[PDB]
């Protein structure tokens, strides 16, 4: 038993959906605690170095970040291991590039470019309502943020729109049958569909049945069902509309691209 | 040192398990406070640095406490005279050692100074016109550094009166 917390991370023990080469090295970056957890995040350096390719080493990324060249939800971050998560705003003014971090059908993080009109807010999932000091009602979300004095009409598992400049709630979408959702965990990450059924078991998990646009049906637990509007998405989504092709069609697409 | 780990016990079949590691600091214990009634000397309370930087205070000597008469909603700070009954053992009584559940006699002055003029339970009033009132301890000295309680009421009062009357 280790006598304290863990600070390192072996490369082979890192999450698969990070797509890290086996021979890159013994070690992988260890994300620091923040808005998102280890298994539902991706470090900034990976995006800035292994994807966009604006840097070729750790040091270059360190200089870029300490020179204030990236804003996360309107706030400059200088930590190369800062965790980036789902429905986050990634803006680089020096090149006028703005991206929203979402999931691809394969189950990995992707950068969807956005516009100026929709980059002043983000969507958050409310999963906990509790009373704080002095009995004051509170409310928490998936990105580690708390808001005091929420509307009584807002319940758990709902979705909340908040302005980036000011953490004030505008409108909220209820968790109900007939609402477009997006799956954010498990075997079905990145799929988009509409809720058709809700079944609860006393003392255990609650299972949600969803149907895709094409008629396919799939199941997942409520812990990773994210509402993204009322029958139509509230934000811009990837070019594909949450359709996972079968191995045959993916092979055809690969051969075509070959 | 003192520990409460279960590795040094026997199994449900009565077998010797065996030992596979040295002692750990999470599983430690400490010597009892043995809080004493006062009856260089004065109220003495110590402080203990517990896991996580948390602070725990154990009382070694004390003489006063807050007591409540629930039926009439009367509460004052009163001086504790001596311990008269304890279910665990009579040795604690002889030594006047304070623990949760001890039955004690308190001074009647703070209560009689305002009582004996309103209709209430006869028995508490008969105690009030005397020098002491039977009471109980509800806090945990050794963990919070205090000795509070409440005044006995009905069937429990009869139980303890019948217990201590022959003595």
């Amino acid at each position: 038993m280790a006598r304290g917390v863990r600070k390192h991370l072996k490369r082979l023990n890192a999450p698969k959906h990070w797509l890290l080469d086996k021979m890159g090295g013994i070690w992988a970056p260890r994300p620091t605690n923040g808005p998102h957890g280890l298994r539902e995040c991706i470090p900034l350096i990976l995006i800035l170095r292994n994807r966009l390719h604006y840097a070729n080493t750790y040091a270059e990324t360190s200089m870029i970040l300490q020179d204030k060249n990236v804003l996360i939800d309107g706030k400059p971050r200088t930590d190369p291991t800062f965790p980036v998560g789902f429905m986050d705003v990634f803006e680089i003014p020096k090149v006028h590039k703005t991206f929203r971090v979402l999931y691809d059908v394969k189950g990995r993080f992707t950068l969807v470019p956005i516009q100026s009109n929709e980059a002043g807010f983000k969507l958050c999932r409310v999963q906990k309502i509790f009373l704080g000091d002095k009995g004051m009602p509170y409310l928490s979300t998936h990105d580690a943020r708390t808001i005091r004095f929420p509307h009584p009409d807002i319940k758990t598992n709902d979705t909340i729109k908040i302005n980036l400049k000011t953490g004030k709630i505008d409108e909220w979408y209820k968790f109900d049958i007939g609402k477009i959702v997006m799956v954010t965990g498990g075997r079905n990450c990145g799929r988009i569909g509409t809720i058709q059924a809700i079944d609860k078991h006393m003392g255990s998990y609650t299972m949600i049945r969803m149907k895709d646009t094409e008629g396919t049906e799939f199941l997942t637990r409520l812990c990773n069902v994210f509402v993204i509007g009322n029958d139509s998405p509230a934000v811009a989504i990837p070019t594909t509309k949450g359709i996972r092709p079968d191995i045959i069609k993916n092979r055809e697409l690969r051969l075509r691209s070959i | 040192g003192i520990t409460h780990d279960k590795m040094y016990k026997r199994s449900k079949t009565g077998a010797v398990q065996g030992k596979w590691h040295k002692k750990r600091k999470y599983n430690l214990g400490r010597q009892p406070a043995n809080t004493k009634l006062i009856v260089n000397e004065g109220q003495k309370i110590s402080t203990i640095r517990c896991r996580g930087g948390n602070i725990k205070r154990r009382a070694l000597r004390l003489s006063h406490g807050s007591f409540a008469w629930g039926s009439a909603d009367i509460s004052h700070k009163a001086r504790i005279l001596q311990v008269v009954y304890n279910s665990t053992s009579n040795e604690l009584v002889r030594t006047n050692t304070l623990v949760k559940g001890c039955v004690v006699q308190i001074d009647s002055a703070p209560f009689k100074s305002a009582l004996s003029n309103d209709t209430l339970d006869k028995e508490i009033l008969d105690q009030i016109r005397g020098d002491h009132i039977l009471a109980r301890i509800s806090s945990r000295p050794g963990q919070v550094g205090t000795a509070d309680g409440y005044i006995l009421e009905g069937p429990e009062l009869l139980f303890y009166q019948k217990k201590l009357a022959p003595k």
Partner: protein
């Protein structure tokens, strides 16, 4: 050696060795410190006022429901 001292000025003759070397004075308040303290006080007052206003408007709302909070005493 040469309380409630408004000017806060001082001497400088000190000692010299050529370069003049004198210890820097500590515990002196000028414009920066006074202004910083005043700004901090104003910020704290503003924060308290905003929180009180938010509580008042929340209480004004919920006219059709029940509330439980620690009443401010004194």
């Amino acid at each position: 050696l040469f309380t409630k001292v408004d000017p806060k000025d001082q001497m400088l003759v000190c000692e010299l060795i050529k370069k003049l070397k004198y210890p820097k004075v500590q515990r002196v308040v000028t414009d920066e410190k006074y202004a910083r303290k005043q700004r901090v006080i104003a910020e704290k007052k503003e924060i308290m006022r905003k929180s009180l206003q938010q509580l008042e408007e929340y209480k004004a709302l919920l006219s059709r429901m029940g509330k439980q909070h620690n009443i401010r005493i004194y």
